[PDB]
Amino acid sequence: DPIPSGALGQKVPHVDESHQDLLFRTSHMVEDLETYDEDSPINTSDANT
Amino acid sequence: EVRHIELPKALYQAYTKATQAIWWPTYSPDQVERQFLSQKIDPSAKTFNDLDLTPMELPDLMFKLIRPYRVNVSQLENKEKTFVHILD
Amino acid sequence: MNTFIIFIILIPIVGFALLAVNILLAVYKPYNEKLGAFECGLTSFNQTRLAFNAAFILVAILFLPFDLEISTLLPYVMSIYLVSNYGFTIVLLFLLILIIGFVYEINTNALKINKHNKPNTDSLIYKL
Amino acid sequence: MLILAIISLITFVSMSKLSDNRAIIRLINIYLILVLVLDSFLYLLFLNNQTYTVMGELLIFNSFTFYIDMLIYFIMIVISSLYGYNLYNNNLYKTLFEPKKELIILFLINILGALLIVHSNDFITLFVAIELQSYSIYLITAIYNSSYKASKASMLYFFMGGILSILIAYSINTYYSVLNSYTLHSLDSLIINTLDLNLILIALSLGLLFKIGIAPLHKWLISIYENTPILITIYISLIPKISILSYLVLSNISINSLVISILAILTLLVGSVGGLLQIKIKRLLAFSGLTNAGYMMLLLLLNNNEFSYLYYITQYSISHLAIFMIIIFSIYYINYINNQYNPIIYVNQLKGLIHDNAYLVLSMAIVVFSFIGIPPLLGFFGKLNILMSILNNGYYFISIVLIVASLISALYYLYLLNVSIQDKNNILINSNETVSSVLSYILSSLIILITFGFIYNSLIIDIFNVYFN
Amino acid sequence: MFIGTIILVLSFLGFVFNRRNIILAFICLETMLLGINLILLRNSVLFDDISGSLFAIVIIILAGVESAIGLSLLVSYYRLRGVINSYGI
Amino acid sequence: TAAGISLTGGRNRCFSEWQSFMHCTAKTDAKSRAQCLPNFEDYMECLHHTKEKARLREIESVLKQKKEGLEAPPVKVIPVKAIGLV
Amino acid sequence: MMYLTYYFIEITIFLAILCTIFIISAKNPMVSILYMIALFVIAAMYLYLIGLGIFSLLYIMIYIGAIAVLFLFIITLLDINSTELSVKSNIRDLPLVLISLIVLTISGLMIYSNDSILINKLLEAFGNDYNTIITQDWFNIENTTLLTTIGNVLLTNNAFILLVLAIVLLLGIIGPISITMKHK
Numbered sequence A: 001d002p003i004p005s006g007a008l009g010q011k012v013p014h015v016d017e018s019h020q021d022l023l024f025r026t027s028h029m030v031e032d033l034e035t036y037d038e039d040s041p042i043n044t045s046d047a048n049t
Numbered sequence B: 001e002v003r004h005i006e007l008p009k010a011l012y013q014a015y016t017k018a019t020q021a022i023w024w025p026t027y028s029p030d031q032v033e034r035q036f037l038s039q040k041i042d043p044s045a046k047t048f049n050d051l052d053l054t055p056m057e058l059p060d061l062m063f064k065l066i067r068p069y070r071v072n073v074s075q076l077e078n079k080e081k082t083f084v085h086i087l088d
Numbered sequence C: 001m002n003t004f005i006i007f008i009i010l011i012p013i014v015g016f017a018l019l020a021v022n023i024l025l026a027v028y029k030p031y032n033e034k035l036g037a038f039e040c041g042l043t044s045f046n047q048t049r050l051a052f053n054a055a056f057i058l059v060a061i062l063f064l065p066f067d068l069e070i071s072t073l074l075p076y077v078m079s080i081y082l083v084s085n086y087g088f089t090i091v092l093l094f095l096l097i098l099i100i101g102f103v104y105e106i107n108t109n110a111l112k113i114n115k116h117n118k119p120n121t122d123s124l125i126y127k128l
Numbered sequence D: 001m002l003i004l005a006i007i008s009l010i011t012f013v014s015m016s017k018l019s020d021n022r023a024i025i026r027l028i029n030i031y032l033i034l035v036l037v038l039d040s041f042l043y044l045l046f047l048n049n050q051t052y053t054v055m056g057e058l059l060i061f062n063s064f065t066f067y068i069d070m071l072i073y074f075i076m077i078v079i080s081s082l083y084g085y086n087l088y089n090n091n092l093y094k095t096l097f098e099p100k101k102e103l104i105i106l107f108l109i110n111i112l113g114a115l116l117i118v119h120s121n122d123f124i125t126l127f128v129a130i131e132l133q134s135y136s137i138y139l140i141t142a143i144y145n146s147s148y149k150a151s152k153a154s155m156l157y158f159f160m161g162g163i164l165s166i167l168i169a170y171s172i173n174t175y176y177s178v179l180n181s182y183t184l185h186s187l188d189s190l191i192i193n194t195l196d197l198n199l200i201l202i203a204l205s206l207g208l209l210f211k212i213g214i215a216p217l218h219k220w221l222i223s224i225y226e227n228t229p230i231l232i233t234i235y236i237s238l239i240p241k242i243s244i245l246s247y248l249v250l251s252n253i254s255i256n257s258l259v260i261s262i263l264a265i266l267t268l269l270v271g272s273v274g275g276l277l278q279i280k281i282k283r284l285l286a287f288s289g290l291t292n293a294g295y296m297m298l299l300l301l302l303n304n305n306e307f308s309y310l311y312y313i314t315q316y317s318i319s320h321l322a323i324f325m326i327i328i329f330s331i332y333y334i335n336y337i338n339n340q341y342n343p344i345i346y347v348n349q350l351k352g353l354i355h356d357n358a359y360l361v362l363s364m365a366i367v368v369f370s371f372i373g374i375p376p377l378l379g380f381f382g383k384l385n386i387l388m389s390i391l392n393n394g395y396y397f398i399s400i401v402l403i404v405a406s407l408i409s410a411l412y413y414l415y416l417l418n419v420s421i422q423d424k425n426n427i428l429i430n431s432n433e434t435v436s437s438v439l440s441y442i443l444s445s446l447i448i449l450i451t452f453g454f455i456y457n458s459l460i461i462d463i464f465n466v467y468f469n
Numbered sequence E: 001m002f003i004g005t006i007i008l009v010l011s012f013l014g015f016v017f018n019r020r021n022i023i024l025a026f027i028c029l030e031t032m033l034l035g036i037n038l039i040l041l042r043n044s045v046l047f048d049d050i051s052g053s054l055f056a057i058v059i060i061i062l063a064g065v066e067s068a069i070g071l072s073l074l075v076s077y078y079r080l081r082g083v084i085n086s087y088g089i
Numbered sequence F: 001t002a003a004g005i006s007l008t009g010g011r012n013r014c015f016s017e018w019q020s021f022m023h024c025t026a027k028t029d030a031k032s033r034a035q036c037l038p039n040f041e042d043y044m045e046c047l048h049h050t051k052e053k054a055r056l057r058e059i060e061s062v063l064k065q066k067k068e069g070l071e072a073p074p075v076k077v078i079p080v081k082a083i084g085l086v
Numbered sequence G: 001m002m003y004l005t006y007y008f009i010e011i012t013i014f015l016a017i018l019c020t021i022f023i024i025s026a027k028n029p030m031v032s033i034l035y036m037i038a039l040f041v042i043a044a045m046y047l048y049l050i051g052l053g054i055f056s057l058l059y060i061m062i063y064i065g066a067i068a069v070l071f072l073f074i075i076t077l078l079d080i081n082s083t084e085l086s087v088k089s090n091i092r093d094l095p096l097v098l099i100s101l102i103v104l105t106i107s108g109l110m111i112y113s114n115d116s117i118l119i120n121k122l123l124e125a126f127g128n129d130y131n132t133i134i135t136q137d138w139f140n141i142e143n144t145t146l147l148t149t150i151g152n153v154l155l156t157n158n159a160f161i162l163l164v165l166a167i168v169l170l171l172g173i174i175g176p177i178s179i180t181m182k183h184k
């Protein structure tokens, strides 16, 4: 419930299926901090079908 | 892009005169001569109007008239992901 | 300037001369309907690239290793007497190793295009 | 034994169904163990540091190479256990961890390439072995081809590793153009004094070292580590590093190199600082690997590096295996599975692990403190040996930078333990399924080695004195 | 050795500053290997030494296998996406 | 190893210098090894002809700086067709 | 004759430069593959000129006959997008391209020298103003060519290398099947 902090105490995201949205794909972000997941089971539902 | 070259009239007239030696039609020396003449409409002559006719426009016709010589993303990738590209 | 080099230069010249004669003598009257691709007299829609089978890829890809295998035997056949019995044993070992890979390819059915649709063989059962 | 296993496996796997995969892996697992315990006695050949050239001087066998080969066998045994044995028997774990049909063959071929790199006495042997290992590693990165990230990673690996393979080949050919030779054995003290080989040999060193991802060419490999399936990442971030570093340690072609000194400093700084803002577990572990690579890079500047290198690489391999196994074990206790290739992604998903499995967190604490270097854990003695080596040879500024990097990287090491010992609101009461006996025993053996190995330190040095002097 | 060196350098620059397509990257790899082999073969001739030519033969075989594997990787990458972007990697 | 083998399976162009240098290194030790510096020098000379090119540069510089005639048995270049003519 | 035939090597070099530039600048990547084939024919020409016609034939057999064929096969089956060379996209590279060209070319010529002084290192690169003297002897009684000698050393002195190469080719079979075929 308290917001996660990182190794330097900086703000860190909490992750669950919310981060696999429509407006957060193609986000401009460094790969170290990018949370969109193109292998997530909710973005890969009908791939190669 | 269409390639245009400007040349001196003497050089180009000499070329067209030389090329008149082959048996198939080729740009004339007299067509080079006419290249320096702009169209001059007689002030007193009947026109398309007297035939109750209305000429079409070159810009609207050009695409149809020239069709055989025509040269020829973000959503497409996402849509492509759902299809099959390789099979057994 | 031996016959070899002269002959090799001469062949493309003759090809180009025949091409030039055809360009010079045949008529040339392109127009839109003539310029269409011939597909049985009709016109088809432009399509995304066809989905292809993996065997099509696999024949071409597997050509290269097998071709290299075959071509690696050229030094052996050009040196067979010099290396006689030792090299004969070595080349046998090399061939056997490559044959294991051939075995893998054969047993995995890697170049077979399987007809996806097959006759239904299920029994007909009625719940009485 | 290895070549035989590769041939037999290709045939057997060709005749086997996809359901036999794990069984086949188990077989190979026990086979490897047998080779380790029945063929071990061959160490006797190297008594008093006797060196053997083999295969018309293409290969070199000594006590150093024999030890590295044993270590690589042990690592392969541990990693293949993770594919041959199910953590749990439920449907989710079947989906998470299923070995591909050809994966075991690719692992064994890659191990062959690594062992050939280690034993390489001629540059043609080195290049053939390097390309064997590189091609195998690309295929290992690609074999989980339902994953978008893995396929992209495999392409990136192919191209960057190809450019670096080209650099290595060009180095070897410049060496040949100067000396009409393909072996480092032709180098003498007189030759080194007479000719300037520094540019050629450093080009070779850099070509090899960028392939394991030292700074400033670190991000591409870290990306590949992040984007592979976790059980692939455990293998591909360890074996190449061992093979390349062992070859460079045994070759000693960069002694007191200014360029290597500067790149080692940069690697320590980048590895320590760049791990600080990471929130993904695999990126954090990749920066840890970068820092430990810098530590080992320091040993390429001096002669008589064998004891400190062997100690460091052994304890580091043990700790790397242990931390990845702990992360794998913790998957059962997390709330949210991110995807089937990387079930756990963020460090914060370990929050409150102590309330679900206290002894798993004790194992984590031991491993983390070993990475930091607390005595009497193995990591402390690895760092101590490295410091002895570098200070004996006058690398004072680098020793200070080593201390600073150790302190800095301790922060992101402690991040894992910190979140892991906090409180979580809904804790585990009971569960009917137990995690596998085999994998838990293997993890515990690694933890016990990290904890109590120091007891054998003086005995180990005594043996080393008779096999390496 | 000039022709090999120029081929290698220009192929490397083409690979690096490629911002057009992925096939150019494949081609630049192949041609860098070709340039290296050319340099090696000239030195082999000037020394009258078979070691250079032996290494060149091995380089040719390895370039073949590397081409096969690289194109397999490309096809596997294509299988999920159906297209290659001008950043396709 | 293929070291020492020429393009025709014999001994390569600089084999003799290399073999004499290897004899030297085999007889000496690390402390004495510098005693073998001339042999190695000769080896590198055979490989790269550096001193020979320098000496030719010197001779050619002095040749092109002379207007006085040369009276010595000369070198004559002939067509390959004229090998053995006259 | 002489004027052309003396500078055949230089012509191959100039053609190689031009062919590489054409590879990188081609609009259609198929045209780029064709210019790669052209570069390989030029390399075969150079190898013939320096006395290695057998390697000319091998390069034609393997890199054009096999590798370029696979290249074309793949670009035909696959959907590739490409952008054209343009100032908007590529003039930004010109400074780095120029610095890298000079530095890499000079260093690639200097890595061959053994002189302590850097300027002498670079100067030796352009230092072949002399002809090699080709001489005869009679010690070789056998008809041993380059291919025969390669076979001799590859199958006896370096047999281990041949067997390891067999493993590499095994990889070139097993791997493509592993990632391009879907089992069951």
Ligand SMILES: CCCCC/C=C/C/C=C\CCCCCCCC(=O)O[C@H](COC(=O)CCCCCCCCCCCCCCC)COP(=O)([O-])OCC[N+](C)(C)C
Binding pocket: D036, D037, D038, D040, D041, D043, D063, D066, D067, D070, D071, D074, D306, D307, D310, D311, D314, D315, D378, D449, D452, D453, D454, D456, D460, D463, D464, D467
């Ligand atoms: C019955 C067959 C069982 C043998 C199977 C061995 C598998 C190796 C697997 C994993 C490697 C783990 C570390 C290997 C131990 C090094 C032995 C040695 O002393 O290393 C020395 C060289 O020291 C070094 O450089 C430094 C080594 C750094 C070790 C750092 C870890 C220390 C903690 C280990 C504590 C020991 C646990 C004992 C549990 C009661 C080589 O000794 P050696 O080459 O003469 O061979 C030994 C004779 N042998 C083949 C029969 C076994």
